[PDB]
Design an enzyme around this catalytic site. Structure first.
Site, PDB file in Angstrom:
ATOM      1  N   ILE A  84       0.850  -1.227   0.000  1.00 47.85           N
ATOM      2  CA  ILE A  84       0.000   0.000   0.000  1.00 47.85           C
ATOM      3  C   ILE A  84       0.870   1.256   0.000  1.00 47.85           C
ATOM      4  CG2 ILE A  84      -2.037  -1.111   0.959  1.00 47.85           C
ATOM      5  CD1 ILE A  84      -1.162  -0.155   3.765  1.00 47.85           C
ATOM      6  N   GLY A  85       2.200   1.140   0.083  1.00 46.37           N
ATOM      7  CA  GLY A  85       3.080   2.311  -0.091  1.00 46.37           C
ATOM      8  C   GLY A  85       4.537   1.907  -0.254  1.00 46.37           C
ATOM      9  N   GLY A  90      12.217   4.987  -1.457  1.00 48.67           N
ATOM     10  CA  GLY A  90      13.646   4.624  -1.356  1.00 48.67           C
ATOM     11  C   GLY A  90      13.957   3.805  -0.104  1.00 48.67           C
ATOM     12  N   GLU A 128       8.961  -0.027   2.617  1.00 50.87           N
ATOM     13  CA  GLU A 128       7.672  -0.389   2.006  1.00 50.87           C
ATOM     14  C   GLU A 128       6.637  -0.639   3.090  1.00 50.87           C
ATOM     15  OE1 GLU A 128       8.927  -3.667  -0.385  1.00 50.87           O
ATOM     16  OE2 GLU A 128      10.250  -2.349  -1.460  1.00 50.87           O
ATOM     17  N   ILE A 129       5.376  -0.435   2.745  1.00 48.25           N
ATOM     18  CA  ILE A 129       4.241  -0.602   3.676  1.00 48.25           C
ATOM     19  C   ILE A 129       3.255  -1.548   2.981  1.00 48.25           C
ATOM     20  CG2 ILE A 129       2.612   0.489   5.252  1.00 48.25           C
ATOM     21  CD1 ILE A 129       5.047   2.717   3.308  1.00 48.25           C
ATOM     22  N   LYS A 146       5.008  -2.325   8.029  1.00 44.76           N
ATOM     23  CA  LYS A 146       6.057  -1.455   7.469  1.00 44.76           C
ATOM     24  C   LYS A 146       7.432  -2.130   7.590  1.00 44.76           C
ATOM     25  CE  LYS A 146       7.288   3.341   7.210  1.00 44.76           C
ATOM     26  NZ  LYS A 146       8.759   3.460   7.035  1.00 44.76           N
ATOM     27  N   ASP A 164       8.130  16.598   8.095  1.00 39.21           N
ATOM     28  CA  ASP A 164       7.478  16.489   6.764  1.00 39.21           C
ATOM     29  C   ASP A 164       5.966  16.464   6.933  1.00 39.21           C
ATOM     30  OD1 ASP A 164       7.775  16.843   4.013  1.00 39.21           O
ATOM     31  OD2 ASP A 164       7.755  14.610   3.661  1.00 39.21           O
TER      32      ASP A 164
HETATM   33  C1  LIG Z   1       3.770   6.597  12.075  1.00 39.49           C
HETATM   34  C2  LIG Z   1       4.750   5.541  12.394  1.00 39.49           C
HETATM   35  C3  LIG Z   1       5.661   5.151  11.246  1.00 39.49           C
HETATM   36  C4  LIG Z   1       6.138   3.764  11.541  1.00 39.49           C
HETATM   37  O1  LIG Z   1       6.796   6.052  11.162  1.00 39.49           O
HETATM   38  C5  LIG Z   1       4.962   5.143   9.943  1.00 39.49           C
HETATM   39  C6  LIG Z   1       4.458   5.122   8.860  1.00 39.49           C
HETATM   40  C7  LIG Z   1       3.946   5.132   7.513  1.00 39.49           C
HETATM   41  C8  LIG Z   1       4.760   5.585   6.462  1.00 39.49           C
HETATM   42  C9  LIG Z   1       4.289   5.577   5.156  1.00 39.49           C
HETATM   43  C10 LIG Z   1       2.989   5.119   4.911  1.00 39.49           C
HETATM   44  N1  LIG Z   1       2.305   5.001   3.703  1.00 39.49           N
HETATM   45  C11 LIG Z   1       1.031   4.501   3.936  1.00 39.49           C
HETATM   46  C12 LIG Z   1       0.868   4.287   5.327  1.00 39.49           C
HETATM   47  C13 LIG Z   1       2.147   4.684   5.951  1.00 39.49           C
HETATM   48  C14 LIG Z   1       2.640   4.692   7.258  1.00 39.49           C
HETATM   49  C15 LIG Z   1      -0.283   3.786   6.149  1.00 39.49           C
HETATM   50  N2  LIG Z   1      -0.029   3.442   7.417  1.00 39.49           N
HETATM   51  C16 LIG Z   1      -1.073   3.027   8.170  1.00 39.49           C
HETATM   52  N3  LIG Z   1      -0.833   2.781   9.469  1.00 39.49           N
HETATM   53  N4  LIG Z   1      -2.350   2.893   7.738  1.00 39.49           N
HETATM   54  C17 LIG Z   1      -2.559   3.243   6.464  1.00 39.49           C
HETATM   55  C18 LIG Z   1      -1.583   3.730   5.614  1.00 39.49           C
HETATM   56  C19 LIG Z   1      -1.942   4.248   4.239  1.00 39.49           C
HETATM   57  C20 LIG Z   1      -1.212   3.558   3.106  1.00 39.49           C
HETATM   58  C21 LIG Z   1       0.119   4.222   2.779  1.00 39.49           C
END
Ligand SMILES: CC[C@](C)(O)C#Cc1ccc2[nH]c3c(c2c1)-c1nc(N)ncc1CCC3
Length: 293
Positions: free
Chosen positions: A20-21, A24, A27-28, A43, A134
Site C-alpha cells: 500500500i506504499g 527509497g 515499504e508498507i 512497514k 514532513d
Molecule cells: C507513524 C509511524 C511510522 C512507523 O513512522 C509510519 C508510517 C507510515 C509511512 C508511510 C505510509 N504510507 C502509507 C501508510 C504509511 C505509514 C499507512 N499506514 C497506516 N498505518 N495505515 C494506512 C496507511 C496508508 C497507506 C500508505
C-alpha cells in the site's frame, strides 16, 4: 524487487495481502493478523539498507502510545532480510480526500476541525522530543472504524529528528542542515537549509490549512525547491489569509516570531481554531465534507 511477496507470513502471524506504499527507504503492506483477524499495516526496511531509519520510527511510535491521533503499536522485529513494524491500519489520507472535493477545497468547518487534530498530533510528537519535519496532507489519514472514522492520524516518522539530547535539553542546531522533505509545505527556514525546529512543523500546518480552505497555494505549479523557496521568501503571507478567518493573523504572527530555540504557544494556535469555529457557530459534532451528511 518488493521486500515481501503476496501471502508472505511474518512471525507466523501477519500475512501480506498487498503493498500500500513504497519509497527509497522502505515499504508498507496491508496484512491480515492471523491471531486477532483484523487487517494491519506492516512497514518493512531492508536489513542491508545503509540508513537504518525504522528503529527510530518505532521508538517514536512507542513513546506516543496512549496519545490520540497515534496508530496503535502492535509489534516489531528484525531478522537477516528485513526489519518490520506492525501498526494499526488507517484509511483515506487528507490529500486524496481534498482532491476528491469538487473544487479541491474543504469547507471551513472541515478545515478548522482537522487543524485542531493535526495541531494536537504535532504537539504530541514535540512533547516526546521529536520533530516530524514532513508535515503534509498525505501524512494524515482518517480512521476506518466506527470508533475512529472522525479521527485524524499522523503517519510516517521516516524524516523525524530528535531535537533534545539524552537529558531533555534542546540540542545545538547544525549551522547547515540539508532539507530533504516535501517542497510545497516547507518553511522558509527549511528552504534555507537551516536546522528545523518545532516552529517549522507549525509552518507546514499553516500552509496546509490555507490550501484546504482556499484550494491552492501560490507556488503549487512550481516543483523546483530553490524557486519555491524564493517565491515564499518574498510572498506577503498576510495575503494568504484574505479569504481565511481574521484569527489566522494571530497564528501567522506567532509562528513568524519563533526561532529554533523557542517553544511554540500551541494553546494560542488551538484558540485561533476554537475562536474561528465559535464565531461561525461550527460544532465539533458536524459531518466532515466527505461524509453523506
Ligand atoms: C507513524 C509511524 C511510522 C512507523 O513512522 C509510519 C508510517 C507510515 C509511512 C508511510 C505510509 N504510507 C502509507 C501508510 C504509511 C505509514 C499507512 N499506514 C497506516 N498505518 N495505515 C494506512 C496507511 C496508508 C497507506 C500508505
Amino acid at each position: 524487487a518488493d521486500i515481501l511477496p503476496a501471502n508472505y507470513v511474518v512471525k507466523d502471524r501477519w500475512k501480506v495481502l498487498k503493498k500500500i506504499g513504497g519509497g527509497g527507504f522502505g515499504e508498507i503492506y496491508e496484512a491480515m493478523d492471523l491471531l486477532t483477524r483484523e487487517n494491519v499495516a506492516l512497514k518493512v526496511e531492508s536489513a542491508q539498507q545503509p540508513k537504518q531509519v525504522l528503529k527510530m520510527e518505532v521508538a517514536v511510535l512507542k513513546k506516543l502510545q496512549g496519545k490520540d491521533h497515534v496508530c496503535r503499536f502492535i509489534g516489531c522485529g528484525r531478522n537477516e532480510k528485513f526489519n518490520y513494524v506492525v501498526m494499526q491500519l488507517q484509511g483515506r489520507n487528507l490529500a486524496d480526500l481534498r482532491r476528491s472535493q469538487p473544487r479541491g477545497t474543504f469547507t471551513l468547518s472541515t478545515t478548522l476541525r482537522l487543524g485542531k487534530q493535526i495541531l494536537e498530533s504535532i504537539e504530541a510528537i514535540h512533547s516526546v522530543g521529536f520533530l516530524h519535519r514532513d508535515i503534509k496532507p498525505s501524512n494524515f489519514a482518517m480512521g476506518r472504524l466506527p470508533s475512529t472514522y472522525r479521527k485524524c492520524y499522523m503517519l510516517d516518522f521516516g524524516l523525524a529528528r530528535q531535537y533534545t539530547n539524552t537529558t531533555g535539553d534542546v540540542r545545538p542546531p547544525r549551522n547547515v542542515a540539508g532539507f530533504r522533505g516535501t517542497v510545497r509545505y516547507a518553511s522558509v527556514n527549511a528552504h534555507k537549509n537551516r536546522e528545523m525546529g518545532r516552529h517549522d512543523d507549525l509552518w507546514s500546518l499553516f500552509y496546509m490549512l490555507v490550501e484546504f480552505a482556499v484550494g491552492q497555494l501560490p507556488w503549487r505549479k512550481i516543483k523546483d525547491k530553490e524557486q519555491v523557496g524564493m517565491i515564499k521568501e518574498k510572498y506577503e503571507h498576510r495575503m494568504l489569509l484574505k479569504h481565511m478567518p481574521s484569527e489566522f493573523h494571530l497564528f501567522l504572527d506567532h509562528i513568524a516570531s519563533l526561532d529554533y530555540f523557542t517553544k511554540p504557544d500551541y494553546q494560542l494556535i488551538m484558540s485561533v481554531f476554537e475562536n474561528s469555529m465559535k464565531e461561525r457557530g461550527i460544532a465539533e459534532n458536524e459531518a466532515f465534507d466527505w461524509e453523506k451528511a
